Amino acid sequence: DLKGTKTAENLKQGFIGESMANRRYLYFAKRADEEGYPEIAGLLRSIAEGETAHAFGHLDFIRQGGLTDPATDKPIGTLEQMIESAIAGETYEWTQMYPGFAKVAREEGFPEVAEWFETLARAEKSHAEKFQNVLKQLKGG
Amino acid sequence: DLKGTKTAENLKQGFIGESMANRRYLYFAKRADEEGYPEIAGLLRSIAEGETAHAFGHLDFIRQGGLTDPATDKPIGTLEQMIESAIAGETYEWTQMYPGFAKVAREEGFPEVAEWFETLARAEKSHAEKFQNVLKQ
Ligand SMILES: [Fe+3]
Ligand SMILES: [Fe+3]
Ligand SMILES: [Zn+2]
Ligand SMILES: [Zn+2]
Structure with missing residues (x-):
């Protein structure tokens, strides 16, 4: 059981950081877009996809563990x-x-x-x- | 400049919340996708775009206000x-x-x-x- 453990708290914090990372990188990508750095913008967007995978992975463990x-x-x-x-x-x-x-x-x-x-x-x-x-x-049917 | 103000901290907290909201709604959308609720999945995805606009707006104020x-x-x-x-x-x-x-x-x-x-x-x-x-x- 993960409830009440430090790992449960770390999954939570992990999710927060990864969520912020994706938003940050996509925001940064727009600056690179504006200035003419498609390689950099593309990298930011691809790495952002990685942070999405990370955040969702944290949520899977949280959900599968009965955490909130x-x-x-x-x-x-x-x-x-x-x-x-x-x-x-x-x-x-x-x-x-x-x-x-x-x-x-x-x-x-x-x-x-x-x-x-x-x-x-x-x-x-x-x-x-x-x-x-x-x-x-949903509840109404 | 917003340095040292409570608003500065609120912009940071707002950014965190909006960032989490977008990830959460897209994750929720996958469940709706799997179960066959395209309209609900679509709404979650659209609202998620709204949270993206919110998060970026917070970053704009942070960046323009001299914050980190x-x-x-x-x-x-x-x-x-x-x-x-x-x-x-x-x-x-x-x-x-x-x-x-x-x-x-x-x-x-x-x-x-x-x-x-x-x-x-x-x-x-x-x-x-x-x-x-x-x-x-
Ligand atoms: Fe990551
Ligand atoms: Fe919002
Ligand atoms: Zn990373
Ligand atoms: Zn909202």
Whole structure:
């Protein structure tokens, strides 16, 4: 059983890092695209595919071990549970996280960032609603 | 400049969350694919694109606000700096992180997971080497 072990925690941290790596490399690739470095952009994109394989591998061990979603601490064994995890995360983001981030940004004098956080808050609310509709489809039959 | 502000930290946390969301939704989509729910799989994939836009937006503000890479705490203003950040992260992973994870996995009685971490350790080393070769240019 992996529950409660350090390995369980390391699988979680491993997933976080790999997720960030893929986003970072694809972001970097756009800069290489812009400047005319197709070889470098291509490498970034290919290595990014590697980080995807790594992240999914971590999730397989987590799922197969009965561990929870690194992002929501919710089970992800079944498709229904996966959707429920998506809903939980999106709900936290639009009801508390992004609104809180936006408030702090305004308070610190960064209205541009605040507006970005507010845009995202509304976006995650829409995502949550979309996922809830999917859950009703699955559980409804 | 955003240095030293709470907003700086929030941008970092937002980036991490959005990064995880994209990986999670694409992973979930594979299950929907397998079970025969193309519309649900498609929606997950489309929402995942939304999370990509969010993550990149966070990085834009981080880069423009004079902040560092959420994963390595290194500057990412120029392409050169971006590659250097990739190298730093990969180096941390193959020299310390994954080997350490593997040792602990073996000690706790998880040889299969340990082998996985060892596979990744070798992979990250290879990644670091490829990036370093690109650093000249
Ligand atoms: Fe990796
Ligand atoms: Fe998002
Ligand atoms: Zn979302
Ligand atoms: Zn790598």
